[PDB]
Write a protein that binds this DNA or RNA. Structure first.
Lengths: 48, 121, 48
DNA sequence: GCTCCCAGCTCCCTGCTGGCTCCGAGTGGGTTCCGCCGCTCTCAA
DNA sequence: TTGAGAGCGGCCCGGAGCCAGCAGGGAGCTGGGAGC
RNA sequence: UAACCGGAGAGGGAACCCACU
């Protein structure tokens, strides 16, 4: 992971990510959520 | 019969030879003294000018064994051990010299013969 | 995908999550000497 | 003016926060190391 | 006979369950007084 | 008046450090 100019939600994939996937921790270092909307709410940036 | 040459000389010899930093049992920090690598003149010079950071080896603490900015002319950058301890062991650079230490009483006398007043008055 | 799905289904096959820890593998009754061959030996044999 | 729904009480019980064990990839090679103190008799001067 | 020596004899961090301490509902207990 | 004999297992260990993979 060489990072980026944006935060990009701090993906931090790799050895510690595969570590916590092997032993699931109740508090992972970066618990991230990806959210999809239904329709024109996502189609509009203002409604987004 | 009160003084004991054994308890002074033998204790010093045991401590210095072993490298464990205790008297007989102490735990104690080891690796303080090692055996000189009489293999090459460069090897002897490196082992003589070797520097040790006693931060915890075999650990995931990256920062104290990371390379810091404050090393220009103090330790050569491209000389590290390769194994389990990378960066905790350094070798002294050329111009780098260690301060021997001195008493600050003549310095304080210089201040007070000069005009720098103490905090209580 | 064969090995990956096999790993995940063997993880989830006990009706719940299985983190790869002593704290799980001691709880599954999968052989006292399996438990001993894991990182804790004397306690799991001594409880068995 | 005593039961009984109710109020305060009162224990009752499930529900939240701290000290604490236990883990932390493979061989060679060299060096250091494993009592001390007490105590009584033997030979020397 | 006494003095010291030889030898025998004794005396740098990680997670994660986990118990214990405390805090809020909860029905019993018996008063309060409404009711008869 | 006396006649061919054959024999090889090992001895500590424990710690620290260094080096290499």
């Amino acid at each position: 992971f060489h990072y980026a100019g944006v935060s990009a939600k701090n993906v931090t994939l790799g050895v510690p990510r595969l570590k916590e996937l092997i032993n699931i921790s109740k508090k992972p270092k970066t618990p991230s959520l990806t959210v999809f909307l239904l329709g024109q709410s996502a189609r509009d940036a203002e409604r987004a | 019969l009160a003084i004991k040459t054994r308890i002074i000389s033998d204790g010093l010899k045991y401590s210095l030879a072993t490298g464990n930093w205790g008297d007989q049992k102490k735990q104690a920090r080891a690796g303080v003294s090692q055996v000189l690598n009489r293999l090459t003149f460069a090897s002897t010079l490196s082992h003589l000018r070797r520097l040790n950071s006693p931060i915890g080896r075999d650990g995931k603490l990256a920062k104290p064994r990371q390379l810091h900015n404050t090393l220009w002319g103090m330790v050569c950058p491209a000389e590290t051990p390769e194994g389990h301890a990378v960066g905790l062991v350094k070798n002294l650079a050329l111009m780098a010299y260690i301060s021997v230490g001195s008493q600050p009483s003549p310095i304080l006398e210089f201040l007070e013969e000069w005009s720098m007043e103490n905090l209580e008055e | 995908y064969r090995h990956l799905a096999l790993l995940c289904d063997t993880m989830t096959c006990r009706g719940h999550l299985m983190a790869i820890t002593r704290h799980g593998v001691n709880r599954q009754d999968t052989g006292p000497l399996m438990k001993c061959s894991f990182e804790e030996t004397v306690d799991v044999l001594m409880e068995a």
